[PDB]
Amino acid sequence: PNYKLTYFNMRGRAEIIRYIFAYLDIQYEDHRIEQADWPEIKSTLPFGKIPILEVDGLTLHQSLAIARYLTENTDLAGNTEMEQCHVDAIVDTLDDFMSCFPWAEKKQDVKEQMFNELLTYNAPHLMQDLDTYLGGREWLIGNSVTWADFYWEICSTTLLVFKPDLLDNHPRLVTLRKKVQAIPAVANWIKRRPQTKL
Amino acid sequence: PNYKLTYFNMRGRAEIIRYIFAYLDIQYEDHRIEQADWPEIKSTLPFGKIPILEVDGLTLHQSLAIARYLTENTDLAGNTEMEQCHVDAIVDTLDDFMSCFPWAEKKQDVKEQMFNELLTYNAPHLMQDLDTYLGGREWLIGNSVTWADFYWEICSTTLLVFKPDLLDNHPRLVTLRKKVQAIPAVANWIKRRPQTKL
Ligand SMILES: COc1cccc(-c2ccc(C(=O)NC3CCN(CC(F)(F)F)CC3)cn2)c1
Ligand SMILES: N[C@@H](CCC(=O)N[C@@H](CS)C(=O)NCC(=O)O)C(=O)O
Numbered sequence A, B: 001p002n003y004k005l006t007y008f009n010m011r012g013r014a015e016i017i018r019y020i021f022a023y024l025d026i027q028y029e030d031h032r033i034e035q036a037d038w039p040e041i042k043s044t045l046p047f048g049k050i051p052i053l054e055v056d057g058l059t060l061h062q063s064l065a066i067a068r069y070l071t072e073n074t075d076l077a078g079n080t081e082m083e084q085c086h087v088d089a090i091v092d093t094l095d096d097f098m099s100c101f102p103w104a105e106k107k108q109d110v111k112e113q114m115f116n117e118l119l120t121y122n123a124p125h126l127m128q129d130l131d132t133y134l135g136g137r138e139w140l141i142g143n144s145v146t147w148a149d150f151y152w153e154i155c156s157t158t159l160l161v162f163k164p165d166l167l168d169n170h171p172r173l174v175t176l177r178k179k180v181q182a183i184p185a186v187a188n189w190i191k192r193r194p195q196t197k198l
């Protein structure tokens, strides 16, 4: 069973796949491309977008669809059909925000303006809604860790790059961030992975 | 279970759920609202976004996460993990494009411009990709209809209001809509459902 992950040299939307792998102890090759190799590959893929996962000469796309596939009947999945939902909902609420950023804007000031808006106007509200949804439970979904707990910590990672005082009023979020990061197989990948801004 | 789905009087985000309910033949409370009682409601919601589904007072959110949850252990789900990964991928790719529209934009002309240019440049790029992902095959994924075909006809239905000629060069994509529409339960729902623009 053969794994070639394709994406740019960034955590980005691949990091949810790379946390899963290294958690669930599975060998993959981590194929990281140059911004200038991209069009040559972009042309050949059915949907022109990455990440993508090749699974013995089979081509998968859409990080979360993939993420959801590598966790169907595993302990990062929800212990029940309802908890699979909340997981997917939690993930999509975060992707919904993360997906808002003009990541690929080449006009810098125009980009910075848009990033700053969202990080002051929309961010704290998302953090709020999250903390409350967490309330006082140990994980986001049910009684153990799930990949939604991973998406969160990953999304939170990149947001923290751009606005450090973000979780100041949410220790229960810094707690959760940190409790996800201290997991053996997670903790170790965080130590080894390439060191990219994004 | 007792299902209560809450949304506006329209299709938009809730429709994928309504289709699934009809196909699956699941009795459910289809509660629609006018703005009038919106922030009155919005308050009582973990994430203050709709559609939402109450399943015995247990509230669930994210339209796709819910639709998925509702297709779990049916055939609508895709017939194999691998397919289900594809069905998800298409649903996201579809949802990704849709979330690119300024839906609530009240400067009518900025709407028009972006809308028309999104159909101009973005939309036909996704059409060829969908067209050629579909091929001459019957359904988008697998040997049988999955909830990704449902979403295609729901999405393409709404975008066709704004650009009728949208699919005038993708015979095969109009083919897929008709195969979705002629499904008895869906065709029943179609004629039953109330008349709204979107
Ligand atoms: C992990 O937390 C998330 C969740 C969702 C999205 C992202 C995310 C998305 C995009 C990027 C990003 O920076 N993508 C770039 C956009 C610019 N392109 C330039 C291109 F397309 F020309 F190659 C490279 C990929 C980073 N993180 C991160
Ligand atoms: N919903 C998609 C978003 C995928 C996406 O558009 N990825 C970006 C990189 S972050 C991309 O391929 N952009 C470069 C391009 O447009 O070709 C997913 O979850 O994978």
Ligand SMILES: [Mg+2]
Binding pocket: A092, A095, A096, B092, B095, B096
């Ligand atoms: Mg999405």
